[PDB]
Amino acid sequence: WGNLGHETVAYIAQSFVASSTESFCQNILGDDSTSYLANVATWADTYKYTDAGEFSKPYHFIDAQDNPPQSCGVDYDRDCGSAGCSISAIQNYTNILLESPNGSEALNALKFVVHIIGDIHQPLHDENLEAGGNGIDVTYDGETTNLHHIWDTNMPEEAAGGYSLSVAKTYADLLTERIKTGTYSSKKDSWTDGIDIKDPVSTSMIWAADANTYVCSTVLDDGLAYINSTDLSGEYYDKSQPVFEELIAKAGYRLAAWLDLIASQP
Ligand SMILES: *[C@@H]1O[C@H](CO)[C@@H](O)[C@H](O)[C@H]1NC(C)=O
Ligand SMILES: [Zn+2]
Ligand SMILES: [Zn+2]
Ligand SMILES: [Zn+2]
């Protein structure tokens, strides 16, 4: 996701964590604001463009070697790769926070976890096709961009009505209410099924697999002919909105559950 997506995921999670989890995080981050997670939720996207953080670029995705829209699926060993991936990063950074939450590596670990749980839920961060769709040029609202970009940024920013922290907060609030009492409030009871703080690979793969099914059902189900030739800010946006909204909600909720586990220090 772009910044708005990551901040919305972070604010959602802030709404569901226990108060000891909040303190646990605020202490690591040195931030006692009511935006403590949101404020660090984009950091990994900065860090990967620095010389020192270049090595972390692959941690944003798992390039699923599947065949969408006909066939979707993710496999850790097949798809992660030689330089690591979202899944291996969640394992490594989760275990740092389980082993040394007060150590020097915990600050970046937590920043990573907040960001990457977000990324795992962007379906094109779980998809190899044309560099996760970065190679698929498309027209969005009369302007040229790419398919990955409109999922990261154009479409969420349109649905949220902007891109500022306060817009992310308002968006998070809307989605959090969907989880509590609205359209997600039944389904959400099963969004943490299979979660296991002692198996970060398996837990994060479930989330990645889940998000990846939407490559076939939604991202690409019209076919590349349509996608390459149609302005995607029309009916494509309308079809995609419920899906990216639910995924951002799942990301927030799952992030909170995972942070509550880490803070509980098993
Ligand atoms: C769509 O465009 C992508 C490149 O951006 C290309 O690889 C693909 O072959 C195109 N497919 C069709 C059906 O136009
Ligand atoms: Zn992202
Ligand atoms: Zn992206
Ligand atoms: Zn990212």
Numbering used by the authors: 21 to 286
Publication text:
S1 nuclease from Aspergillus oryzae (EC 3.1.30.1; NCBI sequence ID: XP_001818636; S1–P1 nuclease family in Pfam, PF02265) is an extracellular, single–strand–specific, sugar non–specific, Zn2+–dependent, fungal nuclease with 3'–mononucleotidase activity with a pH optimum in range 4.0–4.3. S1 nuclease has the phospholipase C/P1 nuclease–like fold stabilized by two disulfide bridges. The active site is located in a surface cleft and composed of the obligatory catalytic trinuclear zinc cluster supplemented by Lys68 and the nucleoside binding site 1 (NBS1; also called Phe site in the previous studies). A cluster of three zinc ions coordinates the substrate/product scissile phosphate and the reaction mechanism utilizes water activated by Zn2+ ions as a nucleophile.
A phosphate ion inside the zinc cluster in the first binding mode is modeled with occupancy 0.5. Phosphate ion is a product of 3’–mononucleotidase activity and simultaneously an inhibitor of S1 nuclease. This structure brings evidence for one of its binding modes and for its capability to bind inside the active site. The inhibition effect of inorganic phosphate was tested on ssDNase activity of S1wt under standard reaction conditions. Phosphate inhibits activity by 70% at 10 mM concentration and by 91% at 100 mM concentration.
